[PDB]
Design a protein around this motif. Structure first.
Motif, PDB file in Angstrom:
ATOM      1  N   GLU B  18      29.264   4.418   3.576  1.00  9.42           N
ATOM      2  CA  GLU B  18      29.251   4.797   2.165  1.00  9.42           C
ATOM      3  C   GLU B  18      30.672   5.104   1.710  1.00  9.42           C
ATOM      4  O   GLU B  18      31.283   6.080   2.165  1.00  9.42           O
ATOM      5  N   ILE B  19      31.171   4.284   0.784  1.00  5.28           N
ATOM      6  CA  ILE B  19      32.526   4.407   0.261  1.00  5.28           C
ATOM      7  C   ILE B  19      32.449   5.272  -0.981  1.00  5.28           C
ATOM      8  O   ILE B  19      31.475   5.198  -1.738  1.00  5.28           O
ATOM      9  N   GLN B  20      33.440   6.144  -1.179  1.00  5.21           N
ATOM     10  CA  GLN B  20      33.456   7.033  -2.326  1.00  5.21           C
ATOM     11  C   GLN B  20      34.314   6.438  -3.423  1.00  5.21           C
ATOM     12  O   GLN B  20      35.432   5.983  -3.158  1.00  5.21           O
ATOM     13  N   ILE B  21      33.815   6.478  -4.651  1.00  7.42           N
ATOM     14  CA  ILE B  21      34.641   6.157  -5.808  1.00  7.42           C
ATOM     15  C   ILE B  21      35.288   7.443  -6.310  1.00  7.42           C
ATOM     16  O   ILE B  21      34.594   8.383  -6.731  1.00  7.42           O
ATOM     17  N   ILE B  22      36.616   7.515  -6.231  1.00 14.43           N
ATOM     18  CA  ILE B  22      37.337   8.777  -6.474  1.00 14.43           C
ATOM     19  C   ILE B  22      37.913   8.834  -7.883  1.00 14.43           C
ATOM     20  O   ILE B  22      37.777   9.837  -8.573  1.00 14.43           O
ATOM     21  N   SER B  23      38.606   7.784  -8.325  1.00 14.48           N
ATOM     22  CA  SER B  23      39.213   7.792  -9.653  1.00 14.48           C
ATOM     23  C   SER B  23      39.389   6.346 -10.072  1.00 14.48           C
ATOM     24  O   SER B  23      39.507   5.462  -9.221  1.00 14.48           O
ATOM     25  N   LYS B  24      39.392   6.116 -11.376  1.00 14.50           N
ATOM     26  CA  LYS B  24      39.514   4.766 -11.923  1.00 14.50           C
ATOM     27  C   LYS B  24      40.523   4.808 -13.049  1.00 14.50           C
ATOM     28  O   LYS B  24      40.493   5.723 -13.876  1.00 14.50           O
ATOM     29  N   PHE B  25      41.408   3.824 -13.087  1.00 13.04           N
ATOM     30  CA  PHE B  25      42.184   3.511 -14.280  1.00 13.04           C
ATOM     31  C   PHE B  25      41.587   2.217 -14.810  1.00 13.04           C
ATOM     32  O   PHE B  25      41.421   1.280 -14.045  1.00 13.04           O
ATOM     33  N   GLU B  26      41.180   2.196 -16.082  1.00 12.80           N
ATOM     34  CA  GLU B  26      40.102   1.265 -16.430  1.00 12.80           C
ATOM     35  C   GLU B  26      40.573  -0.169 -16.649  1.00 12.80           C
ATOM     36  O   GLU B  26      39.798  -1.099 -16.399  1.00 12.80           O
ATOM     37  N   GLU B  27      41.806  -0.386 -17.115  1.00  9.34           N
ATOM     38  CA  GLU B  27      42.252  -1.729 -17.503  1.00  9.34           C
ATOM     39  C   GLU B  27      43.782  -1.816 -17.516  1.00  9.34           C
ATOM     40  O   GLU B  27      44.430  -1.153 -18.324  1.00  9.34           O
ATOM     41  N   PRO B  28      44.380  -2.587 -16.597  1.00 10.79           N
ATOM     42  CA  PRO B  28      43.724  -3.325 -15.507  1.00 10.79           C
ATOM     43  C   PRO B  28      43.074  -2.329 -14.529  1.00 10.79           C
ATOM     44  O   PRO B  28      43.538  -1.180 -14.401  1.00 10.79           O
ATOM     45  N   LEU B  29      41.989  -2.757 -13.892  1.00 14.20           N
ATOM     46  CA  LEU B  29      41.185  -1.849 -13.073  1.00 14.20           C
ATOM     47  C   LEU B  29      41.920  -1.495 -11.788  1.00 14.20           C
ATOM     48  O   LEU B  29      42.259  -2.369 -10.984  1.00 14.20           O
ATOM     49  N   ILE B  30      42.122  -0.191 -11.580  1.00 11.12           N
ATOM     50  CA  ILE B  30      42.727   0.352 -10.377  1.00 11.12           C
ATOM     51  C   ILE B  30      41.805   1.478  -9.931  1.00 11.12           C
ATOM     52  O   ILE B  30      41.543   2.404 -10.705  1.00 11.12           O
ATOM     53  N   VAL B  31      41.271   1.379  -8.717  1.00 10.04           N
ATOM     54  CA  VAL B  31      40.244   2.303  -8.240  1.00 10.04           C
ATOM     55  C   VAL B  31      40.728   2.945  -6.944  1.00 10.04           C
ATOM     56  O   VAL B  31      41.098   2.234  -6.007  1.00 10.04           O
ATOM     57  N   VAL B  32      40.752   4.293  -6.901  1.00  7.84           N
ATOM     58  CA  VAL B  32      41.025   5.017  -5.653  1.00  7.84           C
ATOM     59  C   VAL B  32      39.694   5.222  -4.929  1.00  7.84           C
ATOM     60  O   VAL B  32      38.706   5.662  -5.542  1.00  7.84           O
ATOM     61  N   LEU B  33      39.633   4.818  -3.655  1.00  7.14           N
ATOM     62  CA  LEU B  33      38.399   4.799  -2.883  1.00  7.14           C
ATOM     63  C   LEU B  33      38.560   5.697  -1.671  1.00  7.14           C
ATOM     64  O   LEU B  33      39.608   5.692  -1.026  1.00  7.14           O
TER      65      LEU B  33
END
Ligand code: CO
Ligand code: CO
Lengths: 194, 196
Positions: B18-33
């Motif tokens: 199970e991977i955690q979604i921590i933070s998102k910058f929406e566009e362009p999409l950058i996701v800290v996991l």
């Protein structure tokens, strides 16, 4: 512009815990932090918040009442936010559930406001549990969101001379769509607040 | 615009983790996991990168791609669930180490338009932190004023397959100088079409 938060590197060494610096949005400064509260400390803060027990003194959400656990955490938080705990309003606990959200807002007060005299300068939101789905802390003018993860936190500050940067800290709590959401918030004032 | 990464909520449930979604910058999409790799998996990838022993097959920048084995297959399967693209589009796990007094200059992961390598261009990246960096070593996005700090087992995902190409050029990124310790990362680059 200089920031109140001044920690460089990847960790913040506090007296009783090593905090992890996870990501930084630079201006306005929004910082995701790891390892802020232990799992048991998270559970204890919720348990304290639901309980109606209080200590006896001679003579939405809610601020908690001071005890040995809560003082330990404000001390830790003070190291993170670079402002004495005396400036914090205390551990405020908020809980929202399915079919609820927290509308977007600024954490500081208007210049014409009465509480603007000793206005809020910075915020720490601590995630006290895991949210099944939803419950992000979102900054709509920045297109940035922080997802709840138990023990982590988001720091942000709004004490800039260019008040445009300050108005970019507009934020809300996104709808919970599965489960429930518990957060602790520390609001810090420019001067001693007690 | 619609993104390749298509995970709502706060976790990604893959076959084995199970991977955690921590933070998102929406566009362009950058996701800290978070929780992308176990501590032991991180250690194993580093040790595999250090070895120059390799299998031999009939017929024959910086960092190095790992040979396919059970570990890399397992990880590529997990990553494919995160990135929503079959692992056949992945280039395979690339391991990079840089130490104190070193950095990775800012660049694009995709290839220039109309270039020979753009024929099957990269569309998305996952960067996995394999160790804790004493100080420095952030993955920084200079046009966005955003940085992700290294944390063992965590990862940053980002994509650059937008129809508005300016969104793709906002994913310019680098590896900031390590000022104490050293930095180890694994990267999966994903192509528009089949790569392996
Ligand atoms: Co608020
Ligand atoms: Co790159």
């Amino acid at each position: 512009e200089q920031t109140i938060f001044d920690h460089k590197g990847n960790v913040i060494k506090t007296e009783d815990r090593e905090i992890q610096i996870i990501s930084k949005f630079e201006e306005p400064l929004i910082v995701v932090l790891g390892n802020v509260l232990s799992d048991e400390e998270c559970d204890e803060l919720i348990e304290l918040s639901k309980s109606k027990l209080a200590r006896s003194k001679v003579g939405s959400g809610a601020f908690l009442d001071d005890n040995e656990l809560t003082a330990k955490i404000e001390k830790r938080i003070s190291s993170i936010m670079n402002v004495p705990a005396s400036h914090g309003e205390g551990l405020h606990i908020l809980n929202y559930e399915v079919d609820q959200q927290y509308k977007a807002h600024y954490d500081y007060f208007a210049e014409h406001s009465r509480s603007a005299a000793n206005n809020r300068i910075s915020t720490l939101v601590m995630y006290l549990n895991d949210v099944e789905e939803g419950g992000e802390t979102f900054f709509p003018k920045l297109n940035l969101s922080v997802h709840p993860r138990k023990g982590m936190a988001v720091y942000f500050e709004y004490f800039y001379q260019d008040q445009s940067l300050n108005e970019l800290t507009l934020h809300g709590g996104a709808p919970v769509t599965k489960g429930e959401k518990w957060i602790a918030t520390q609001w810090v004032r420019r001067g001693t607040y007690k």
